[PDB]
């Protein structure tokens, strides 16, 4: 949850992890905490339709301007529809859900656009695995600043993609972990409490400060 994420971020940030005499960032690495999902591609068509995105497992989703969300699974037929009040429906495109046909068409447009024009983030990352019987998250909300796009997934994860240098953070409050993707596309997953104890480089530290500000904002607009 956001409240938990805020506590976790406040704790590591208050410890001033980059203002230590010797930094041992490597000691905070925990590959067992790598996220299952993150946003790999996105398109902002919120001028007219909404925000379309791809998850790392190749599923696609859209957060429509009317606050409903639709997800198309990587098998290309399965659907999960989330209504304004959070009601979830599991359907198939092949079944021809009458009320959803226009939304399905828009989603396929997004899927095709992203596949033809956009680079998959975390292409070199292998997500962890857990269950499978019920587990695809949808986009709860998002916003953009002059510096980044902030994506909040229904599984509690918060992702921040920085525009200027292509660096990215994937924060998970369940694992209390952060995955940092650097400008070279190299990545690491760190336990936040271990960064507090062992320190980290400026850069990750500055991005974690920014993340806290973004989380406070998400909580303010709750």
């Amino acid at each position: 949850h956001l409240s938990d994420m805020l506590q976790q971020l406040h704790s590591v940030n208050a410890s001033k992890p980059s203002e230590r005499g010797l930094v041992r960032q490597e000691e905070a690495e925990d590959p067992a905490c790598i996220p299952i999902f993150w946003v790999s591609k996105w398109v902002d068509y919120s001028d007219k339709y909404g925000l379309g995105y791809q998850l790392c497992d190749n599923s696609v989703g859209v957060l429509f301007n009317d606050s409903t969300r639709l997800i198309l699974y990587n098998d290309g037929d399965s659907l999960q529809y989330i209504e304004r009040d959070g009601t979830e429906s599991y359907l198939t495109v092949s079944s021809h859900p009458n009320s959803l046909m226009k939304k399905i068409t828009l989603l396929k447009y997004f899927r095709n656009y992203m596949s033809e024009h956009l680079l998959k983030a975390g292409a070199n990352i292998t997500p962890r695995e857990g269950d499978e019987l019920a587990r695809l998250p949808y986009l709860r909300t998002w916003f953009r600043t002059r510096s980044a796009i902030i994506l909040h997934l229904s599984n509690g994860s918060v992702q921040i993609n920085f525009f200027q240098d292509h660096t990215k953070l994937i924060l998970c409050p369940l694992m209390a972990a952060v995955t940092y993707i650097d400008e070279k596309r190299d990545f690491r997953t760190y336990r936040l409490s271990l960064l507090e104890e062992y320190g980290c480089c400026k850069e990750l530290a500055s991005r974690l400060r920014y993340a806290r500000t973004m989380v406070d904002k998400l909580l303010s607009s709750r």
Binding site: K41, W42, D44, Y45, L118, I149, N161, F163
Partner: peptide, 7 residues
């Protein structure tokens, strides 16, 4: 940008 990083 109105889209994520191009191919």
């Amino acid at each position: 940008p109105m889209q994520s990083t191009p191919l």
